[PDB]
Amino acid sequence: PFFPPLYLGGPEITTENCEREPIHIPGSIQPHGALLTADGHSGEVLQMSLNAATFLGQEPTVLRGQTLAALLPEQWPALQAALPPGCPDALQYRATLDWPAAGHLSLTVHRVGELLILEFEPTETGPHALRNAMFALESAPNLRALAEVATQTVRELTGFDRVMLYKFAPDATGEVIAEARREGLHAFLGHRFPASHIPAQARALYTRHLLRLTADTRAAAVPLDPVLNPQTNAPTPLGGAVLRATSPMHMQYLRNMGVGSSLSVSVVVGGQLWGLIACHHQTPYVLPPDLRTTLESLGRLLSLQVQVKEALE
Amino acid sequence: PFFPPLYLGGPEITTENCEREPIHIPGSIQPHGALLTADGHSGEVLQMSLNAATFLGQEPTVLRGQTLAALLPEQWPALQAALPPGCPDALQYRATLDWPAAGHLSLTVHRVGELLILEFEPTETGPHALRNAMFALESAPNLRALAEVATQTVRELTGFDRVMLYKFAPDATGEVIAEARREGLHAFLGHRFPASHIPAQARALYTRHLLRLTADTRAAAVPLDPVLNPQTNAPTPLGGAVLRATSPMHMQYLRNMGVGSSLSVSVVVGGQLWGLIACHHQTPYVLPPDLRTTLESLGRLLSLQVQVKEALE
Ligand SMILES: *C/C=C1/C(=C/c2[nH]c(/C=C3[NH+]=C(/C=C4\NC(=O)C(C=C)=C4C)C(C)=C\3CCC(=O)O)c(CCC(=O)O)c2C)NC(=O)[C@H]1C
Ligand SMILES: *C/C=C1/C(=C/c2[nH]c(/C=C3[NH+]=C(/C=C4\NC(=O)C(C=C)=C4C)C(C)=C\3CCC(=O)O)c(CCC(=O)O)c2C)NC(=O)[C@H]1C
């Protein structure tokens, strides 16, 4: 069971009490994007990240309380129809928007209960990157080859300095069973780590929401304002949002290992977390949203490939 | 065993001898695109579709014999490295090019032996269209729901007037086991058709090359010039090229049914052709290349979903 978050009086996290960090409701996002929350019926913007004006151009009073119909006239109908009430919180609506700064602005929306959650992030491969990846994965003759091709493909698509396939045992310990990495990196292949390293609430979350990342492992989180959802007077659930602030405890872990940027995709087999495609980069790194989607798609393929090959082997 | 094609003295196809039509080497393409073939080592353009100048702007003598290095300076290195000798003929290199006509020009390249085959077609959704489709497919509780969600998803992505899941029995007859269609269309759900309707050489081809289409079921094919590959003095294999001319026999079948446009993706399970996602539209229709890729990706997911669910059921 969760502690309250730090902003509701909850205690600071330590190595004893880390299984109980409410990692899904940090009340803050990562600084490479902005986030808004809005009413699912009326489209009124209820919360905003304090950096919203940097990405959107409007002010924290000009936005807060306004309707998405007024803010995003072209997207609102399509968005509302894509994410109707009662839908899965994993369902997403994505669109590209123009802004005064060069390039585009990616918008990704999901719904959790009565709330819509809108994530904005800059954008400046595709479906065909994946399509060649599928062939690679499909022709692999055994699980070892599959695991290897999987990590080699992901690294080719992403440029990540380390890409690992991390498989869980029934006791929640994990083993790096395949690894693609930059020449000269110290190898993690075959190493096992304790269950505590990806604690129980994280694993549970990773079964429902299949991709998470830390763009910059020393970047300070940007709070949401107001911190609590006015609909509920409870914390906003950020589990389905990639801009969700990462556990400081995990960021510390990453920095200690010399990791500037991190990303993992879940491999989920029979509704169980089977393992992770776990990636590191030496520097801060923002993976473009369309590459992330591709990775999610690859995770679901690998999950099925694994399920099939494990049944035959 | 195949007849020679019509341009090597082979006989015209009839309802008796249709299992033997060399559908993989028509020596011609569909008119909504252009095609070139080039040497895999030197990049010299060896064959061209007679309509090449319409899509490329150069003349049939200015192109024929020129190197891709000279014609596509930006793509040639990446292309050559993506498709090295000995690779699978299903592997593809895709890029977008600019041209004097509005919009882009899509280039798709594959290699068969010593030959590179370049397909050019106009372009004026994505990876995230697929990503929501995967969720739909994944949550289906049984094969019937899977089949239905599959056809409903494909139709949503494509707008096709009829989308069918067509499952083969061991005798090569097929049954439409799920169907999404425009309101008021006559239903094919549950109907069985004879093995002759998708003859043996077609099924064999569909096991290796997983998507084919007829953009316009009364459009006349555009020949390749020279018709034979100068490397081999034999026909050019067009099995891996979507612009490949469709069997006139099949086009006739389509027109008789009132189908202006057709597309199917293979569902391949344990190296066997399990069925097809088979689509019709009332009018001529060019599906954008990035939507086609997405469909291919969906076919490979459905194949795995089917394999897993059939093992459990
Ligand atoms: C006392 C708490 C601890 C702790 C908490 C923690 N860890 C995560 C998330 C992850 N931990 C991961 C572990 C590894 N990455 C590696 O490279 C290796 C080994 C080579 C390991 C064992 C991983 C992969 C994750 C997933 C996130 C990612 O991909 O970066 C969380 C949850 C983070 C979040 O989602 O906010 C938490 C709370 N880890 C510990 O080691 C102890 C100190
Ligand atoms: C004597 C030869 C015949 C013949 C040849 C033929 N058929 C195909 C390809 C296809 N036939 C298909 C059959 C159907 N489409 C449907 O909608 C239904 C039923 C509702 C059926 C039975 C299909 C789906 C294909 C795949 C191509 C596509 O998706 O359009 C070929 C090969 C075409 C090519 O790839 O060039 C050939 C040679 N069909 C006959 O009925 C007899 C006359």
Residue A144 is part of a domain; what is its CATH number?
A: 3.30.450.40
CATH number at residue A82: 3.30.450.20
Give the length of chain A: 313
Which residue type, as a one-letter code, is found at position A125? T
Which residues contact residue B166 at a Cβ distance below 8 angstroms, ignoring those fewer than 6 apart? B174, B175, B176, B177, B264, B275, B276, B277, B278
Q: Quickly tell me which residue has 């960090």 as its tokens.
A: A21
Same domain, A198 and A70: no
Answer whether the bond into residue A226 is a cis peptide, omega within 30°. yes
For residue A275, the ligand closest to its alpha carbon is 1
User: Residues A197, A266, A252, CA angle at the centre, nearest 5°?
Assistant: 35
Check: CB of residue B230 under 8 Å from CB of residue B114: no
| Same domain membership, residue B89 and residue B171 | no
Residues B118 and B128 in one domain: no
Three-state DSSP class for B242? coil
Query: How far away, in angstroms, is B262 Cα from ligand 2 center?
Result: 10
Burial A26-61 (b: 16+ CB within 10 A, else e): bbbbbbbbbbbbbbbeebbbbbbbebbeebbeeeee
- Which of A253, A255, A263, A277 to probe ligand 1 with, by most ligand atoms within 8 A of CB? A253
Sheet strands (E) in chain B: 28-29, 34-39, 45-49, 93-98, 104-112, 115-123, 162-168, 174-181, 192-193, 211-214, 222-225, 228-229, 234-235, 261-269, 272-281
Q: Assess whether B39 and B50 both reside in one domain.
A: yes
Q: Based on the domain organization, do B81 and B109 belong to the same domain?
A: yes
Query: Can you read off the two tokens belonging to residue B39?
Result: 């040497």
Angle at alpha carbon of residue B277, lines to B5 and B173, rounded to 5°: 70
| Residue B119: half-sphere exposure toward Cβ, Cα within 13 Å | 24
Q: Which residues contact B276 (CB under 8 A, 6 or more apart)?
A: B164, B165, B166, B174, B198, B206, B264, B265, B266, B267
- A20 conformational bin, left if phi > 0, alpha if psi -120 to 50, beta if neither: alpha
- Which residues, in sequence order, are CB contacts of A9 under 8 Å at separation 6+? none
Q: Residue A130 has which token pair?
A: 């994946």
* Partner-chain residue, chosen from B92, B127, B307, that has the shortest CB–CB distance to A297: B127
The bound ligand whose nearest atom lies closest to the alpha carbon of B241 is 2
Choosing from A166, A197, A273 the residue with most ligand 1 atoms within 8 A of its CB, the one to mutate for a pocket test is A197
* CB A199 less than 6 A from any atom of ligand 1: yes
B-facing residues of A in 129-158 (CB < 8 A) are: 130-132, 134-135, 138-139
- Chain A to chain B Cβ contacts (< 8 Å): 76
B positions 290-309 inside 8 Å of A (CB): 290, 293-294, 296-297, 300-301, 304-305, 307-308
* Same-domain check for residues A76 and A182: no
Run of H or E including A306: helix A289-312
Quote the number of domains for chain A. Answer: 2
Please tell me if the CB atom of residue B201 comes closer than 6 angstroms to any atom of ligand 2.
no
User: Are residues B71 and B127 located together in one domain of the fold?
Assistant: no
* Burial (Cβ within 10 Å: 0-12, 13-18, ≥19) of residue B110: buried
Distance (Å) from the C-alpha of residue A195 to the closest C-alpha of chain B?
A: 28
Structure tokens at B193: 């058709």
In the three-class reduction of DSSP (H, G, I as helix; E, B as strand; rest coil), residue A149 is classed as: helix
In sequence order, what E strands does chain A have? 28-29, 34-39, 45-49, 93-98, 104-112, 115-123, 162-168, 174-181, 192-193, 211-214, 222-225, 228-229, 234-235, 261-269, 272-281
User: Beta strand A228-229 with A234-235: parallel, antiparallel or unpaired?
Assistant: antiparallel
A179 forms bridges with which residues in the sheet?
A164
* Closest atom, ligand 2, to C-alpha of B245: 36
How far is Cα of residue B141 from the mean position of the Cα atoms in its chain? 31
Token pair of A213 as six digits: 């990342």
- The rounded distance, in Å, linking the Cα atoms of A157 and A292 is 10
Establish if B92 touches chain A: CB-CB under 8 angstroms.
yes
CA distances, A115 to each of A41, A122, A261 (Å): 9, 23, 30
- Residue A274: which domain range? 123-217+247-313
Q: Give the C-alpha separation, A117 to B23, whole Å.
A: 51
Whether A263 and A278 share a structural domain: yes
Q: How far apart are CA B77 and CA B81, in angstroms?
A: 6
Q: Which atom of ligand 1 is nearest to the CA of A206?
A: 35
Structural contact between residues B87 and B81, judged by C-beta atoms closer than 8 angstroms: no
Same domain as B203, residue B236: no
Q: Whose alpha carbon is nearest atom 19 of ligand 2?
A: B193
Rounded to 10°, the helix A127-139/B127-139 angle is 50
Chain B interface includes A92 (CB < 8 A): yes
Cross-chain CB nearest to B92 (options A132, A305, A307):
A132
Q: Are residues B129 and B275 in the same domain?
A: yes
Q: Are strands A104-112 and B115-123 parallel, antiparallel or unpaired?
A: unpaired
**B95 forms bridges with which residues in the sheet?**
B107
Dihedral sign computed on CA atoms, order B51, B52, B53, B55: positive
In a shared domain, residues B223 and B174: no
B138 and B261 co-located in one domain: yes
Looking at chain B, which residue has its C-alpha nearest residue A312?
B311
> Cβ contact (<8 Å) for A308 and B308?
yes
Q: Which ligand is nearest to the CA of A214?
A: 1
Mention every residue, 6+ apart, whose C-beta is less than 8 A from residue A55.
A33, A34, A99, A105, A120, A121, A122
Task: Report resolution (Å) to 1 decimal.
Answer: 2.5
Among B210, B290, B308, B310, the residue to mutate for chain A (most A Cβ within 10 A): B308
Count Cβ atoms below 10 Å from residue B221 Cβ, excluding itself: 18
